[PDB]
Amino acid sequence: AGFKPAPPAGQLGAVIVDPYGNAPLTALVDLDSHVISDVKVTVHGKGEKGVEISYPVGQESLKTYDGVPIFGLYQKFANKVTVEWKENGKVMKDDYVVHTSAIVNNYMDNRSISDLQQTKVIKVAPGFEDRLYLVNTHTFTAQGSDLHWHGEKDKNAGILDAGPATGALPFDIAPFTFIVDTEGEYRWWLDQDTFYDGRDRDINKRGYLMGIRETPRGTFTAVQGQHWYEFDMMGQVLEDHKLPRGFADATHESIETPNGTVLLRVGKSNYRRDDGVHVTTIRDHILEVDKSGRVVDVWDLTKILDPKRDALLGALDAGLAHAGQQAKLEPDTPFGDALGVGPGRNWAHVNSIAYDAKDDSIILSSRHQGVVKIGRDKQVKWILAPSKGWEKPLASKLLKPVDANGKPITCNENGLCENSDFDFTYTQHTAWISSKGTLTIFDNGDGRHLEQPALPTMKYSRFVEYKIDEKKGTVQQVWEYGKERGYDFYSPITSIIEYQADRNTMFGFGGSIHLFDVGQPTVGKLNEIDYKTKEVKVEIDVLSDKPNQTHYRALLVRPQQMFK
Amino acid sequence: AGFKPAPPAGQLGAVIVDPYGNAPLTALVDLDSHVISDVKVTVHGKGEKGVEISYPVGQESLKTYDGVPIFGLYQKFANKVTVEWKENGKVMKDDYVVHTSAIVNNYMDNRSISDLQQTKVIKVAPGFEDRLYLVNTHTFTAQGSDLHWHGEKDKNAGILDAGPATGALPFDIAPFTFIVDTEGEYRWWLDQDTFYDGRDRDINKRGYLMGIRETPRGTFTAVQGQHWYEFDMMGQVLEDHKLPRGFADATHESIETPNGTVLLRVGKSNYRRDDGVHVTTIRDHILEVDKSGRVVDVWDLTKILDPKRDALLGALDAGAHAGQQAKLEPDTPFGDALGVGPGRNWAHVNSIAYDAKDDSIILSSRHQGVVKIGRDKQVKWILAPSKGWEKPLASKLLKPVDANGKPITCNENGLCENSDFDFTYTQHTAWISSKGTLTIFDNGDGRHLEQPALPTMKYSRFVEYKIDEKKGTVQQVWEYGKERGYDFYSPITSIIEYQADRNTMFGFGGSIHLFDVGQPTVGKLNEIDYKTKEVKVEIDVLSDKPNQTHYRALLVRPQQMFK
Amino acid sequence: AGFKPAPPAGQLGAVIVDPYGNAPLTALVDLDSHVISDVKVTVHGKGEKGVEISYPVGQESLKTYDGVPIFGLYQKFANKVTVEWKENGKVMKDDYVVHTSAIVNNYMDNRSISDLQQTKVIKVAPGFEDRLYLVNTHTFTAQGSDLHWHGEKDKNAGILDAGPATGALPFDIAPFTFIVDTEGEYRWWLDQDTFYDGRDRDINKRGYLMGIRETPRGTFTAVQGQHWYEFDMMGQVLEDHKLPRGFADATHESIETPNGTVLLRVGKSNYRRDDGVHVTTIRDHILEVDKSGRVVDVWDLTKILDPKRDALLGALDAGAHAGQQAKLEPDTPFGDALGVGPGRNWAHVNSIAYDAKDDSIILSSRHQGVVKIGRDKQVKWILAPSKGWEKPLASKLLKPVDANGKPITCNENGLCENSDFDFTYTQHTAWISSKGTLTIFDNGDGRHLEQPALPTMKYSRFVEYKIDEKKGTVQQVWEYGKERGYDFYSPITSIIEYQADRNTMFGFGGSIHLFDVGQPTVGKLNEIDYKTKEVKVEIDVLSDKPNQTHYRALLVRPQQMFK
């Protein structure tokens, strides 16, 4: 004999904790050749106020896992799990005790407050107890940024000098990926080693895990460094693709379209500038790729927008900590991940993508320029931004602010409006299309009205929603929130909103609250705001495990959709 | 810085050889940020009778490779290549001299005749000089089969005994993957390290590279051991998927459907038999999987067909001990062995065809026949001699008919009276031609459910059928090879596929002379005129070790490779 | 059972080609549980003037390989091999025909002249026909240098600027590693994938394969990037160590001591300068490490020597912009660049010798000279022109003397009056011959701390010295090459080593014609008679791409390879 496999737990197979080895708060009930249907799983709340997690499991899932997927376990706990099915026409039920192990943070040093990120529940309105949020955050590595792309030497550089760096390889950090419930408990953990290894020098396993977005299959896409991925809630890495050889440094976003493709935000490696110098470009290219990893289309933004436009670039906050100081651009800023104009500098900093199925177009959030729609035809359709700095042909594409009745609102070139609640967005994020059809944006608000304010705390962020009339070329602000909440609700970077049709709320995550508060944990604030009354239905704070460490994004995840 | 990159070769960028590192007879012309269109590549023939290779290159390819793909080089040679394009409305052309290195066989030993498999051009009709063929063949490793799946110990077994083996892990061999032109020159090579490593004991890089099929994108799918793949002619691995956790041992076939899914042939690991014993089943499940590697559907053939049917199994060549008829036993231990029941090689399914018309699959069972099975998991029809089949299945058997539609009388063994009609035996590649007919490679071992008096009395056929599903009849409408006898007999493997572009039947017999101890095995590439039956192409491929079968070959077209 | 292993070839086991998968011109005769002794292998020459290769094989090797190691095959050939042994007191012999595959260069592009480096046999004196030489050379990758270490941003730098680079990660190139016989045939090849992968971005498989040195076991040590290695002539990787975490960028040398430790040349990562800025230092630390990869000792040369000394640095060829004298600057950014101070290439140490007699190390500093440093971390003596050196170091300078022991008068630039005596400049391989003398390859760039009127006025020397450490004197006792002029001038790399078996000076000039734009670079293998100065061997190796330096070569002996 050798060693036997786990024996059957009840009326099906063994119950396997973490089948794929990437998700320790998950398990699987082995099917053991049983033919079953009507499968329904219930993970009971831990103790008194504990949140219960419940979902149906589809056939494709049962077939793919060869078993019933168990999602929503607590760490280091004797979880109580109920699985119900139909077998041979008869109704069946098993009760399992599924013991779990611990969540490990593999990236800790003297900066660490503790191992895990802390949660504080601030508000949970009745009827929102069941909400689950996936938090896409990260934690500093001991080493810090240790690698650069090698670039091309400029003719004006010292003859003796080594070659310069290029691109944005140092944009690299350990991931911290979990689902939190409304009691503030971790109910899912993605092992950090799934995608990342910050101790090895294998660039295939470095980067910044970002752009976690749900697919039509209830699975998720993601980007990290030079690869893009698809994974599921069982921790199965379903796709792992290298970027096509011409491109590098995928960050911020990955979204599956209805046509089966995936949009990514990358840079072009070995991009030849008009002066013949080769650079890796920064955050200014869009790819459409298929599940074969092949390029279906590319948008080179350096030829579509205006890379010499510094209207917003010059209005920016230097901040860490050289904070509260307006960015002074320089002609000789060396190429690299650096504020500046031109291909090879961070002139666009595109940070989100939305696919408009209606006209086969894409909407981009550019942190440093504004928000634009670009066609399949590579033509600018419209731009949402202050008018300053834009030249013709592009100035003609700026949308015109109007009111509820459609009458022009009067705005200066800096985007400051007269006698109106209307305001443009500035250093914004997640310009997405809601189920309503409108354009929702997280208006971070750094460099608002194209200047820094008199004092540093005079900043605020907004959840805003616009209605756009494309034929008329008009934009109407139709909803906003957070303007009154001041610095204490200001995320200078990252962050996301998304409209939730099911309970008519606006979901939001402010990812860098108190970023600049030296020695203080950064706050990620999960919010759900009632769309009609503007009341807080959910407010949950996530505190970084090291001081002054931004979070990136969060998602409202629904267990009902996870296992098609 | 420090060391500079390759400089531009002509008017575009550098020309890199084997950019992905898996295809040493390819190159890439870096785009270097040039905006180009109307691209056309030409690789010139080597010497006097050398075959030129020419193709257009699409925008998707330009964008994917960040350059112009150069396919069809010769090894260890100063290839002459011409690239034409349009840029700023101007017509542009470059001529490049692209030097290549050598093709390496990493699996040689005292059995090796030489390093590479030898090609002999026998016949090339005018107008067929341009043809290219991808040969999916293999080469023995020094150690042979070295790993087994662990099975469950049987209760009739000894108390002290170690557990048995199960499944088919030993089905494992180094790949030998190349494209040959009609001068018998190698024009493409897939490095053996791309997918395989027979020296390491990482099961993820083991198995039997098989089922190389073109996709709608001009790329190819393949299976090997516990993974399935997609790659392209630049040697880029586009997909690499583990089989879903319930399944094992993917062999023989992989085909992309029009719905974006892929059909695979696997076995079930930890399959619970009715007597409670768990086994890895052998070559009797079909998976439909999506490009995420998830299971869209599963056909469990042990519940759809009849695993107890020994009609054809009992009548098989044992081949060390070839020639002999296979005497089955009730106690054959579970494993990759001839036998009945789940956990033995009762079915040995070796090809799949998706029928888009009714959303069903056509399967070739080496040991049972050819069957259509529906999305609903119901048998729609069976092409096979009637012996051994019982109701409810017996009634799905197709009935042979003539050109006018009248019954052909056949005994239960598939022997027909006064007819060219014959069923298929131990067959392969039951596919659906562009005509809508069923093409099969009829290997012919166990023909008429018996062994012949003499081994040399065996023959193989290309054969084609017209099926009326409504009427439930089958009509043999084309055959070839019966009259070529033994020197055309492939006991195993092999394939045919109807070519509409030039009305030929393409064929590859993979195991000609397999049983001639000490002799190279012959893989014969053939294009046969569909009307005249004239041999338009015949090329023989000889194994680099004796008694080493080839699997399949494909007719590849350069103008489809780079979408 | 499934697929059988290779069967026995003769009276032992199967004969496997490239058993470890890294050395395609080797084979192994499986022992198959035979108990043998007195083993001798003979690989016969190819054709008329072919060099036979013969050697004994020890019990340790038999046991390690589980078989008889076959070394010295030709590529793509039916090698004839004879194996003799003793078994049960009977004398035994087998003759094997061992077929091989081809040698592959995986790094080719439009710069490629052809796939392999070309060899030209110029001179082979009788009694030197058997000589074998391992050539440690390299080949440009398509992309060139693509990665940098990230450094610490300097406070005099722009607020908006991204952080700078540091260290020498770009020092990275595909290896080209082979053994040539005196017919100029390749008799061994180390697969480039053994250690390197220039297509992937796994830094563990990057760098510059260097410092290949024989060990007391007849195996070899090497360094590449962030790892050090030990391998043998069967292509077996015996050790693979990461550098200790404080260190980076191992280049140029690796030598095993008699105490079981290994000496390496690295840089320090996160080295804190006195101004508080952290850098990866360049080529200025020596590690002694044990076979566990642990640090036994460290020599930090930035505290032992003088990093501010620009005597030789200021006088260097800039070579794109070759010929020009190097005009140093105070603001040269830290990095792999000519300059003073920690974090610039002030030292560029390129060889190490352990002196067992007093437990000290002799170093060659390309930019400073030759120095002995003790276990105690004290400078024992310095071989260099006196310019730029200040006390306390100035006083450790050796003083030149004649055969009778009398002073030779030299200016501060190393120009001597009425003497053959000259110091070394930008030199390499300051080793200790079996005679106890110091041998150096005097490249000669920056000779006499100046550039010449004309570039063609440069020459290189083999040179030998007798040092009295007690007296503090140095005596030039042998030189060669000054009178061969430019066609013998190696600006960089290169090596010599005294051969006692036949009283020759072995040499390899690695960069002959380096600056002839568009021309292959020449690596010249030489054995020079120590008494007569007659050229006993001269073989030229030509780079596969223009202007591509070679590093080193070693004289290898088959009868030592298999302990």
Ligand SMILES: Cc1cc(=O)oc2cc(O)ccc12
């Ligand atoms: C300044 C900064 C820090 C960070 O950790 O992440 C970022 C992500 C962005 O998209 C833009 C800016 C930052």
Ligand SMILES: Cc1cc(=O)oc2cc(O)ccc12
């Ligand atoms: C009998 C046999 C030997 C082999 O080497 O390969 C095979 C492949 C198959 O699909 C079926 C049978 C065989």
Ligand SMILES: Cc1cc(=O)oc2cc(O)ccc12
């Ligand atoms: C100048 C130079 C070029 C090179 O390719 O390799 C080198 C190696 C060295 O140790 C020192 C200098 C060089």
